[PDB]
């Protein structure tokens, strides 16, 4: 059954009606299919915005139960070399229709991983077979796509999911499976999602697993932070205040206590402090330059692995030195 | 240094077949082979070290095969060591075999000659008739130094960790069945590494396995297999080695197998001859663990 | 209809757009290579595109080959005097019973016979598929065998290589 | 399912091609005279290279187009064996074309052929040039080996001007009876960036999605080009403004960091407003950021630090 | 036996010959096995444009046991690595038995000889969401139907394979006075070649060109189907053992081939999207 | 139809296919010349060192029609040749890919051919699509018909008369065993029927030998190893050796190993031998090896046995090999070494 599947797959939209946050694109595609004027599509966007789900739902709507033999889907997991493009795709696009269901769709998922030769060969396949064949190209990085392929496909940008769409989908998930989510917990979940629905679903599943009895227990912000392990906003505010106001010893003690009470990671703390500082009042540009450069260098050092205490002291010193420029 | 050999296929067909088998086997493994002509016997060696890894083939042919056997040299035991291209000798041997099949009593004469027209490099002047057309072949060959010849040595196999397996004669009632058993695994496309296993208590049984994430091939033998005068003995070997063993088994009768657990495989073939009994020519093939346990 | 660079081709050695010094050097080298027992066996001409390598080679052959070519006694293929001053290798020839890599070999093993009464200048401008590793190795081995060959007589061999870059291809 | 207008209204005669008037007139004269030489047409994608070559071949041949044109392309195998057999036999084929005409081998997207294929093409052109002519079409002319270039006349197609795009768009709109305004056509031209295929596709999408063509309607389907936003981000007086542009117009719109860095490098290459040293330092910082992103740290903080370093260099 | 499905037989040669018809469909694809009381069905689909379905009847198997009363049939999937060679096989009779116990258990094939015992296990795979039954022929509207001998069709397919055929044209025409024309026109490096079957009953038996309806037969209309030879050559092996071949074209352009040898093979292949003008002109010239 | 010919015999089909395959072996494109009396399929390599000719008489085909006056398309292939007897001969020559012709002429595996037709149509009422295309119609015994229209390029014919000169020299020098007189008369008849013209410097050597021995020797030879072939003729024996020359590199290192394979027979075994009074000649092996196999394909029992005739002269002069069949003539010309 579907109950065994992870929520990221159990709650995969089955129809375009369940797709949220892409209203303009959804309406444009509805009009295209209704008027029978669907052009070559290029869905460009970051991970987990609903490109694969949207195209699958569109294919279901156009055909219905024939989606198996009306659509050819190729992704990175499959071989997509020049030879594959020259034989399999060419054969699929050069054959007549089973039931004259409009056209044949080719979903080149994760096409940004295709080789340049494959794209060059595929451009003329796209151009030659367009009377009864359609192409959809899904990508997260456009610079990996050849300029000609970009020009020959109508581009649709999948923006990060707005807050309202994610709230609606969370409400639908809660209704489907008995569970309660506090407004503060929902706000924290939205903040940590950063416009990714996969993160939303994974965190919700893990938070339900965190709750002892998922029948009468309500998800709270504390549960969300404990499950995700990310710092709470209060900890970030306190550590920033200590760094910007307290002495070196006090700041070191505060940071150590904050990151040892819950075993927090320094990368998350630095990201939170950066986000907080990005919306502060600065009277000098050199302060911002110092903050940005030093913090970016510290994150780069952290990415490679080093001494945790050294990096924490580096963050504290960089912040203190940069903020000394003011006044 | 004088070398003169005379061969007659009509007389003593068994030893002629032995020579054919040795030449074909050496030519089906590598490009060049070592020939040691001694006062008592002729040795044909196919080894990777020339002048797991690939296996080694050693063939010993008694001097009684050749009607005339004149081997004279200044080295001990009048040993003459040569390096010869297997393809040339193999082609000459096909020519002689078809000439004999056409029906003739001609004798093949092999001599060593120096070539000033062309590590001294010499030629083998293989000459035979065909009823008459004179067939002559100057096969290039390289004379090998005494020390270099001494470098090549027969592999040694431990006899305490090894158990011999006696195979049914090819001419017996079980010969065809055992040949089919051997060839069972020579018809699968992607199979490259077979897994031979021997179980003691039919006193003993031999099985061939192929394990894969998708495939599981397993062949048992139910015929009477004897052990030449503890039950876990397995070895992984390439399919080419097993095919070579299969071809070898189809020619000889007293075939013996041995599996040194996770160490190697030994395939021994002997040709009995009546008279005490004459020296028994042998063919020994050593196969190294392709993958191992 | 005919393109001018083909219509207005040189009719003599004096119409070739080649400097005097380079022309004299090529003349001397080629004349030396035509001697009964010539020290030099291969003339390797390298240069950019359209610098008149093949043009000057052919123009010099038209004058040199008739001078050294031994007269025949009615052994010519046809009644014509066998106007074959230059023998060139064609890299797109696909005969039936021959592997591709063996094509050039089959050319060279024939080219050796174009000496004395059958004297002809062997020009190699259309190289085999040297981008194939095995083909390139075979070509190098054949050239080495030609250089180290042990025949009393060989025909002059000229290899014209147009030095050019290979654009970065996908 | 009607065909898209990019293909429905594909020009069939050279006189219907807008822009590059000089080269199109030269092609018309070539078609009239018929003495077509070997040629290489290079230019930006979607400006009328394939269309121009096909129209020239059609005008030259007519009833003999099918038997006198051998169209090869990237999607079709174009190896050394192909040159050895198919191209060779086509060149050897003896036709009966009018006195001043020759067979045409259209090697579209010729900048992707293998080196061995081009080396064989050298000989096939050296031998079969009396009755066969080659019309290479590519984006970069240098991608054809020099021996082949030596025999071919080079035509570089320029980027389409606004006037030609507007004229062709107006003709298409009149044919389709599409309702339009001035601001909408201006926006379509601005977003086209000289690529007429992109312009036609955007116009069709806008009309099919919203009906009447408007500036807002066009902007809905098509966003502002990424390079212009990046250029505005780079050319800034205050670091705060550059950060605001990067956040609102690039990060929040769903643009990956790698794309932003690559476009920043491309823009800095062609920018001519500051001294060489400043541009050099900007390129250096962009390269450092690209390195730090390729190893996994594709965060917004890295781009912010890159902008801060660039601004410090400017001052 | 104590298994959901267990069959045993001695006519291993027939099963091997029938299974040898599945080779041309590649080695990186998969084979669907349908188990039912009626018998065995082997299904392969390639490029979503060609499919083959081979039926093995109950009578062929000496003993058949289908104890899965819960479901009238069982679906399983097997990867074709070298399974074609596995079921390929001296003097002594060889008994072939197939065993399968529900989903999650390997498909077991055991060969029993006088002194040799073989057992091979094949792992199963998740059934592809793609429905292999999506490609079928509509019986209501059949453009034309033909009956041909297997030997002649196999010879023609071999001839096309030899010349390196690249594109294939199936041409069918029915005229008055018992005039039947069935031809294969190959576009290849040779140019355009034509192979026309005779009007003799022994080779070409009986023809209709309905024009779409399956009821009325008209005379003068020619049905032309354009195919990629890659798909068309995948039935040559099936035709080699064929005793009779039934061809059917519908208006939609799907080609159906029934191969009768008590083993029946049904193949459906699609037609190419469009026909080039030069190809049509050459077809007209060749047929005049 | 401008040109029409048909074959209705299995052995004739076999020999035709073998000849076409050999010609495709020598050269990628085979040259077919059609005349009122014969059809000549020939080839020559790029080095101009080997020339292979196979002439099929009109009797080789049950039906043979040649109407050059009807040809309109490809007029550049029509040629006219003057004759010594005040006559003009009209011929049409074209070039056809040898591989395609071979792949069209092969006998199907299992099926039999009842008729094999070759036709060229370039008349006034010739469809444009059917212009400069060779028409081939193959009928199977099962009433199946196959049609092919491979492209052919018109060309001009330059006759080779080296064989004529060699025959003239051979007759002048060596012109008793009645068979030798019959050979002399046959050579004289060949010289006279041809529409073209006819001390110590008149070296000429002739050897007629049963093709069985040479064919058996050559079948075993491998061209990849034994590149060269050397013939030694004495007054007592004939030796044929397939050999290779050793090549040594920088430090006297073998760059290419040398192998020899020789067969010697007595002159009594030879059918005929005539020497100018140990004569050694050297040439290539591949073309001779492939050429010796064309004749036996027909497997005829009547007329004469399968004998090969060899003519040669001083080193460096060409060597000529000749074979005959009831309606076919096979000729091979090769260039020999000039070391001595
Ligand atoms: N608009 C949406 N509405 C509802 N659920 C969504 C939406 N977008 C994503 N999801 C959920 O998140 C999952 C992500 O599926 P995808 O469509 O493959 O995401 P994506 O945009 O393709 O990410 P990439 O680019 O493939 S890494 C879906 O299976 C849903 O469970
Ligand atoms: N005065 C001239 N001198 C030399 N070449 C000329 C002259 N006039 C015309 N040409 C032609 O210009 C072409 C260039 O000469 P080539 O010798 O073929 O160039 P190249 O040195 O061979 O370079 P590649 O390798 O062929 S691109 C030839 O086709 C010549 O026939
Ligand atoms: N100059 C032009 N005038 C009119 N329409 C044009 C012009 N350029 C492009 N188009 C239209 O855009 C379509 C595509 O143009 P193409 O010529 O195929 O693109 P392109 O210039 O060849 O780029 P490549 O090389 O294929 S990536 C044509 O079919 C026309 O409808
Ligand atoms: Mg996806
Ligand atoms: Mg040149
Ligand atoms: Mg183009």
Sheet holding A71-74, edge to edge: A71-74, A104-108, A133-139, A41-44, A154-157
Q: What separation in Å is there between the alpha carbon of A229 and the centre of ligand 6? A: 53
Compute the count of residue pairs across chains E and F with CB atoms less than 8 Å apart: 59
Show Cβ contacts of residue D87 under 8 Å, excluding neighbours closer than 6 positions: D70, D72, D105, D121, D124
Nearest CA to ligand 1 atom 30: A12
Distance from CA of F21 to the nearest CA of E (A): 15
End-to-end alpha carbon distance in chain D: 58
Q: What separation in Å is there between the alpha carbon of A139 and the centre of ligand 4? A: 9
Concatenating the DSSP letter of every residue in F13-77 gives: HHHHHHHHHHHHHH-SEEEEEE-SSEEEEEEE-TTS-EEEEEEEEGGGSSSEEE-GGG--TTGGG
**For residue F133, what is the DSSP state?**
B
**Residues that place a CB less than 5 A from ion ligand 4:** A 52
**For residue A161, what is the DSSP state?**
P
**For residue A88, what is the DSSP state?**
I
Q: How far is CA E70 from CA E38, E66, E73, E74, E101, in A?
A: 16, 11, 9, 10, 13
Chain F neighbors of B27, CB-CB under 8 A: none
* Number of helices followed by number of strands (H, E) in chain D: 17, 5
Question: How many other β-carbons are positioned within 10 Å of the β-carbon of residue A183?
Answer: 8
Nearest CA to ligand 1 atom 18: A52
- With CA atoms as reference, the chain E residue closest to D65 would be E278
In degrees rounded to 5, what are phi and psi of residue D215? -60, -45
Resolution of the solved structure (Å): 2.7
Q: What separation in Å is there between the alpha carbon of A36 and the centre of ligand 6? A: 26
Q: F150 with F132: CB under 8 angstroms?
A: no
Q: B152 with B44: CB under 8 angstroms?
A: no
Per DSSP, the three-state class of F79 is strand
- With CA atoms as reference, the chain A residue closest to D192 would be A151
Q: What is the best residue among D50, D75, D189 to mutate for testing ligand 3's pocket, by most ligand atoms within 8 Å of CB?
A: D50
CA dihedral D57, D63, D69, D72 (to 10 degrees): 90
Q: Residue written as tokens 């290479």?
A: D136
Nearest CA to ligand 2 atom 31: C9
Show Cβ contacts of residue C57 under 8 Å, excluding neighbours closer than 6 positions: C26, C45, C86, C121, C123, C158, C160
**Rounded Cα distance, F209 and F239, in Å:** 12
Per DSSP, the three-state class of E173 is strand
Touching E: D residues 38-77, CB under 8 Å = 66-67
**Rounded Cα distance, C41 and C146, in Å:** 8
Nearest CA to ligand 1 atom 29: A12
E48 close contact with A: CB closer than 8 A: yes
Q: B92 pairs with which residues across the strands?
A: none
**Rounded Cα distance, A324 and D285, in Å:** 25
Show Cβ contacts of residue A155 under 8 Å, excluding neighbours closer than 6 positions: A42, A44, D222
Count the residues in chain D.
315
Distance from CA of B63 to the nearest CA of F (A): 27
Q: How far is CA B213 from CA A39, E87, E122, F19, F105, in A?
A: 44, 20, 10, 53, 49
Contact E129 A97 (CB under 8 A): no
**Rounded Cα distance, B43 and B59, in Å:** 6
**Rounded Cα distance, F267 and F120, in Å:** 48
**Rounded Cα distance, F42 and F22, in Å:** 10
- With CA atoms as reference, the chain C residue closest to D35 would be C1
Which of F131, F151, F153 minimises the CB distance to D96?
Answer: F131
Instruction: Give which of F283, F285, F287, F288 is closest to F318, Cα–Cα.
Output: F283
Cβ of A195 below 6 Å from ligand 1? no
**Rounded Cα distance, B196 and B235, in Å:** 5
- With CA atoms as reference, the chain F residue closest to B134 would be F264
Q: Which experimental approach was used here?
A: cryo-EM
Instruction: Give which of A160, A138, A166 is closest to A20, Cα–Cα.
Output: A166
**Rounded Cα distance, B17 and B33, in Å:** 19
Contact between chain F and chain A (3 or more Cβ pairs less than 8 Å apart):
no
CA dihedral E52, E53, E59, E65 (to 10 degrees): 130
In degrees rounded to 5, what are phi and psi of residue A137? -120, 120
**Rounded Cα distance, E24 and D8, in Å:** 40
Which of D99, D116, D129 minimises the CB distance to C129?
Answer: D116
Touching F: B residues 206-265, CB under 8 Å = none
Q: D72 with D85: CB under 8 angstroms?
A: no
**Rounded Cα distance, A279 and B64, in Å:** 102
Show Cβ contacts of residue B278 under 8 Å, excluding neighbours closer than 6 positions: B62, B64
Distance from CA of F1 to the nearest CA of C (A): 30
Q: What separation in Å is there between the alpha carbon of A254 and the centre of ligand 5? A: 80
Question: How many other β-carbons are positioned within 10 Å of the β-carbon of residue A139?
Answer: 26
Token pair of D186 as six digits: 């201006």
CATH number assigned to the domain covering F161-335: 3.70.10.10
Token pair of B292 as six digits: 């191992």
Contact between chain B and chain F (3 or more Cβ pairs less than 8 Å apart):
yes
Q: Residue written as tokens 């009719």?
A: C11
Token pair of E108 as six digits: 């077991």
Show Cβ contacts of residue E125 under 8 Å, excluding neighbours closer than 6 positions: E30, E77, E78, E79
Q: F44 pairs with which residues across the strands?
A: F51
Token pair of B253 as six digits: 């009768």
Q: B6 pairs with which residues across the strands?
A: B68, B109
Nearest CA to ligand 3 atom 24: D45
Contact D66 E278 (CB under 8 A): yes
Contact E191 F150 (CB under 8 A): yes
Q: E259 pairs with which residues across the strands?
A: E245, E265
**Rounded Cα distance, F252 and E197, in Å:** 67
Q: F223 with F259: CB under 8 angstroms?
A: no
**Rounded Cα distance, A13 and A15, in Å:** 6
Q: What separation in Å is there between the alpha carbon of B70 and the centre of ligand 4? A: 81
Distance from CA of F277 to the nearest CA of C (A): 19
Q: How far is CA F47 from CA D126, E126, E180, in A?
A: 19, 62, 54
Q: Is the torsion defined by CA of A144, A150, A152, A153 positive or negative?
A: positive
Helix (H) or strand (E) holding F286: helix F286-291
């Amino acid at each position: 059954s579907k109950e065994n599947l992870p929520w990221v797959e159990k709650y995969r939209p089955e129809t375009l009606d369940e797709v949220y946050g892409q209203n303009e694109v959804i309406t444009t595609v509805r009009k295209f299919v209704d008027e029978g004027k669907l052009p070559h599509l290029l869905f460009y966007g970051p991970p987990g915005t609903g490109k694969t789900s949207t195209i699958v739902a569109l294919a279901r709507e156009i055909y219905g139960k024939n989606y198996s033999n009306m659509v050819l889907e190729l992704n990175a997991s499959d071989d997509r070399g020049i030879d594959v493009v020259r034989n399999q795709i060419k054969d699929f696009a050069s054959t007549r229709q089973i039931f004259s269901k409009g056209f044949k769709l080719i979903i080149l998922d994760e096409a940004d991983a295709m080789t340049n030769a494959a794209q060059n060969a595929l451009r003329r396949v796209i151009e030659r077979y367009t009377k009864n064949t359609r192409f959809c190209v899904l990508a997260n990085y456009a610079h990996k796509l050849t300029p000609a392929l970009l020009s020959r496909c109508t581009r649709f940008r999948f923006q990060p999911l707005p807050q309202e769409a994610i709230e609606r989908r969370i409400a639908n998930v809660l209704v489907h499976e008995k569970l309660k989510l506090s407004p503060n917990a929902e706000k924290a979940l939205i903040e940590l999602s950063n416009g990714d629905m996969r993160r939303v679903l994974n965190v919700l599943q893990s938070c339900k697993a965190t709750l002892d009895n998922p029948d009468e227990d309500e998800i709270s912000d504390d549960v969300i932070y404990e499950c995700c392990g990310a710092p709470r906003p209060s900890d970030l505010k306190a550590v920033l205040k200590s760094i910007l106001e307290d002495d070196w010893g006090t700041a070191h003690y505060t940071l150590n206590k904050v990151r040892s009470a819950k075993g927090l990671a320094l990368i998350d703390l630095i990201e939170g402090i950066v986000k907080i500082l990005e919306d502060y009042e600065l009277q000098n540009e050199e302060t911002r330059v110092h903050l940005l450069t030093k913090l970016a260098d510290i994150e780069y050092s952290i990415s490679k692995g080093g001494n945790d205490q050294i990096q924490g002291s580096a963050v504290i010193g960089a912040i203190k030195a940069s903020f000394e420029n003011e006044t | 240094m004088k070398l003169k050999l005379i061969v007659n296929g009509c007389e003593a067909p068994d030893d002629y077949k032995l020579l054919r088998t040795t030449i074909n086997t050496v030519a089906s493994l590598r490009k060049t082979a070592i020939l040691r002509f001694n006062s008592e016997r002729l040795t044909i060696i196919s080894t990777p070290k020339s002048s797991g890894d690939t296996g080694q083939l050693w063939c010993t042919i008694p001097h009684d095969v050749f009607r005339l056997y004149t081997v004279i040299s200044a080295r001990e035991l009048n040993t003459i060591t040569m390096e010869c291209n297997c393809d040339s000798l193999l082609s000459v041997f096909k020519r002689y075999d078809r000439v004999m099949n056409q029906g003739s009593s001609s004798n093949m004469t092999i001599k060593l000659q120096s070539m000033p027209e062309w590590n001294p490099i010499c030629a083998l002047g293989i000459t035979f008739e065909e009823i008459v057309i004179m067939h002559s072949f100057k096969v290039p060959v390289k004379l090998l130094f005494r020390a270099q010849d001494t470098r090549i040595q027969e592999p040694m196999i431990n006899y305490i960790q090894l158990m011999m397996y006696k195979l049914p004669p090819i001419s017996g009632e079980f010969g065809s069945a055992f040949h089919g058993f051997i060839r069972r695994v020579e018809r699968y496309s992607n199979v490259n590494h077979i897994h031979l296993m021997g179980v003691k208590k039919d006193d003993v049984e031999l099985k061939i396995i192929v394990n894969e994430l998708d495939w599981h091939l397993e062949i048992c033998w139910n015929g009477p297999l004897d052990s030449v005068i503890s039950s876990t003995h397995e070895v992984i070997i390439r399919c080419k080695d097993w095919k070579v063993c299969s071809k070898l088994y189809a020619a000889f009768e007293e075939v013996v197998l041995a599996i040194s657990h996770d160490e190697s495989c030994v395939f021994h073939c002997s040709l009995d001859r009546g008279s005490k009994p004459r020296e028994r020519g042998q063919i020994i093939y050593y196969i190294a663990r392709s993958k191992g346990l | 209809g005919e393109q001018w660079y083909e219509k207005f081709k040189p009719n003599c050695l004096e119409q070739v757009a080649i400097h005097k010094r380079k022309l004299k050097d090529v003349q001397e080298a080629l004349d030396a290579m035509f001697l009964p027992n010539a020290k030099h066996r291969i003339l390797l001409l390298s240069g950019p595109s359209g610098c008149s390598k093949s043009t000057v080679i052919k123009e010099l052959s038209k004058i040199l080959v008739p001078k050294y070519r031994q007269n025949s006694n009615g052994t010519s293929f046809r009644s014509t005097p066998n106007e074959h001053k230059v023998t060139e290798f064609r890299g797109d020839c696909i005969v039936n019973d021959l592997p591709q890599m063996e094509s050039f070999s089959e050319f060279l093993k024939g080219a050796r016979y174009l000496v004395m009464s059958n004297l002809s200048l062997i020009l190699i401008e259309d190289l085999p598929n040297v981008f194939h590793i095995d083909t390139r190795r075979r070509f190098q081995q054949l050239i080495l065998q030609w250089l180290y060959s042990s025949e009393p007589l060989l025909p002059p061999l000229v290899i014209c290589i147009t030095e050019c870059e290979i654009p970065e291809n996908d | 399912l009607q065909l898209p207008w990019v293909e429905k209204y594909r020009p069939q005669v050279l006189s219907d091609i807008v822009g590059n008037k000089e080269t199109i007139d030269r092609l018309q004269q070539i078609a009239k005279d018929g003495n077509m030489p070997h040629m290489i047409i290079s230019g930006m994608p979607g400006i009328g290279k394939t269309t121009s070559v096909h129209c020239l071949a059609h005008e030259l041949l007519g009833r003999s187009y099918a038997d006198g044109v051998l169209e090869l392309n990237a999607s079709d195998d174009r190896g050394i064996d192909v040159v050895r057999n198919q191209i060779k036999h086509f060149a050897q084929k003896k036709l009966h074309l009018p006195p001043g005409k020759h067979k045409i081998v259209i090697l579209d997207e010729a900048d992707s052929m293998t080196a061995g294929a081009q080396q064989a093409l050298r000989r096939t052109m050296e031998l079969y040039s009396n009755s066969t002519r080659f019309a290479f079409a590519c984006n970069q002319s240098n991608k054809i080996i020099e021996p082949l270039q030596s025999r071919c006349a080079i035509l570089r197609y320029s980027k389409l001007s606004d006037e030609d795009v507007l004229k062709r768009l107006l003709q298409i709109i009149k044919l389709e009876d599409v309702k339009y305004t001035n601001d909408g056509l201006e926006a379509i031209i601005f977003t086209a960036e000289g690529d007429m295929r992109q312009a036609i596709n955007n116009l069709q999408s806008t009309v099919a999605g919203h009906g009447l063509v408007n500036a807002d309607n066009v902007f809905k389907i098509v966003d502002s080009p990424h390079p212009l936003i990046v250029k505005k981000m780079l050319l800034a007086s205050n670091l705060e403004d550059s950060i605001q542009i990067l956040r609102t117009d690039l990060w929040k719109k769903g643009y990956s960091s790698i794309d932003i860095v690559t476009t920043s490098f491309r823009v800095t290459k062609n920018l001519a407003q500051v001294k060489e040293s400043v541009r050099l330092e900007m390129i250096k910082e962009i390269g450092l950021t690209h390195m730090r992103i390729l190893e996994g740290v594709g965060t917004y903080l890295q781009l912010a630090s890159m902008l801060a370093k660039i601004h410090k260099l400017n001052n | 036996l104590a298994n959901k499905f267990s069959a045993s037989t001695v006519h291993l040669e027939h099963i091997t010959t029938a299974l040898s018809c599945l080779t041309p469909f590649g080695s990186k694809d998969d084979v669907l096995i349908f188990i039912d009381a009626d018998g065995l069905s082997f299904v392969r689909e390639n490029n979503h444009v060609i499919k083959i379905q081979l039926l093995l009847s109950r009578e062929l198997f000496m003993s058949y046991s289908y104890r899965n009363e819960t479901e009238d049939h069982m679906k399983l999937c097997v990867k074709i690595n070298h399974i074609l060679d596995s079921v390929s096989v001296s003097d002594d009779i060889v008994e072939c038995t197939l065993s399968y116990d529900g989903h999650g258990s390997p498909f077991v094939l055991i060969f029993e000889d006088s002194f040799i015992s073989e057992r091979v296990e094949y792992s199963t795979y998740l059934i592809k969401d793609f429905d292999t039954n999506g490609l079928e022929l509509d019986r209501e509207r059949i453009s034309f139907e033909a009956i041909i001998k297997g030997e002649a069709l196999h010879s023609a397919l071999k001839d096309l394979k030899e010349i390196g055929c690249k594109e294939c044209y199936v041409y069918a025409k029915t005229e008055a006075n018992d005039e039947n024309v069935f031809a294969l026109i190959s576009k290849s490096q040779l140019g355009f070649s034509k192979i026309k079957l005779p009007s003799n009953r022994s080779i070409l038996e009986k023809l209709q060109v309905f024009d779409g309806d399956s009821t009325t037969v008209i005379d003068g209309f020619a049905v032309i189907g354009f195919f990629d030879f890659t798909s068309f050559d995948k039935i040559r092996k099936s035709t080699k053992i064929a005793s009779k071949v039934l061809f059917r074209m519908d208006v939609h352009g799907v080609l159906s081939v029934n191969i009768l040898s008590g083993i029946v093979i049904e193949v459906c292949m699609l037609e190419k999207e469009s026909i080039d003008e030069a190809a049509q002109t050459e077809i007209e010239l060749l047929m005049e | 139809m401008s040109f029409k010919a048909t074959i209705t015999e299995s052995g004739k089909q076999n020999i035709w296919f073998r000849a076409i395959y050999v010609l495709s072996t020598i050269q990628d494109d085979i040259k077919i010349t059609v005349t009122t009396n014969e059809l000549i399929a020939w080839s020559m390599n790029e080095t101009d060192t080997t020339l292979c000719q196979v002439r099929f008489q009109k009797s080789f085909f049950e039906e043979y029609e040649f109407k050059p006056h009807e040809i309109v398309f490809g007029e550049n292939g029509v040629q006219v040749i003057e004759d010594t007897y005040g006559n003009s001969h009209k011929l049409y020559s074209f070039r056809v890919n040898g591989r395609h012709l071979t792949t069209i002429s092969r006998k199907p595996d299992g099926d039999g051919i009842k008729s094999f037709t070759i036709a060229v149509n370039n008349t006034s009422t010739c469809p444009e699509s059917l212009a400069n295309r060779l028409i081939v119609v193959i009928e199977m015994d099962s009433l199946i018909v196959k049609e092919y229209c491979p492209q052919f390029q018109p060309i001009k014919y330059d006759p080779i008369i080296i064989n004529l000169k060699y025959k003239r020299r051979f007759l002048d020098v060596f012109g008793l065993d009645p068979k030798l007189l019959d050979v002399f008369t046959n050579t004289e008849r060949e010289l006279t029927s041809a529409l073209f013209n006819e001390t110590a410097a008149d070296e000429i050597n002739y050897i007629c030998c049963n093709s069985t021995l040479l064919k058996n020797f050559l079948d075993n030879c491998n061209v990849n190893v034994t590149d060269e072939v050397k013939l030694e003729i004495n007054v007592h024996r004939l030796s044929i050796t397939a050999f290779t020359k050793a090549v040594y590199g920088k430090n006297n290192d073998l760059l290419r190993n040398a192998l020899s394979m020789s067969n010697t027979i007595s002159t009594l075994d030879l059918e005929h031998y005539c020497l100018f009074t140990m004569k050694s000649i050297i040439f290539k092996l591949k073309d001779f090896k492939n050429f010796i196999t064309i004749g036996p394909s027909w497997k005829t029992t009547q007329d004469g046995n399968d004998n090969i005739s060899l003519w040669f002269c001083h080193p460096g002069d060409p060597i000529l090999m000749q074979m005959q069949k009831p309606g076919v003539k096979l000729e091979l010309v090769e260039v020999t070494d000039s070391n001595i």
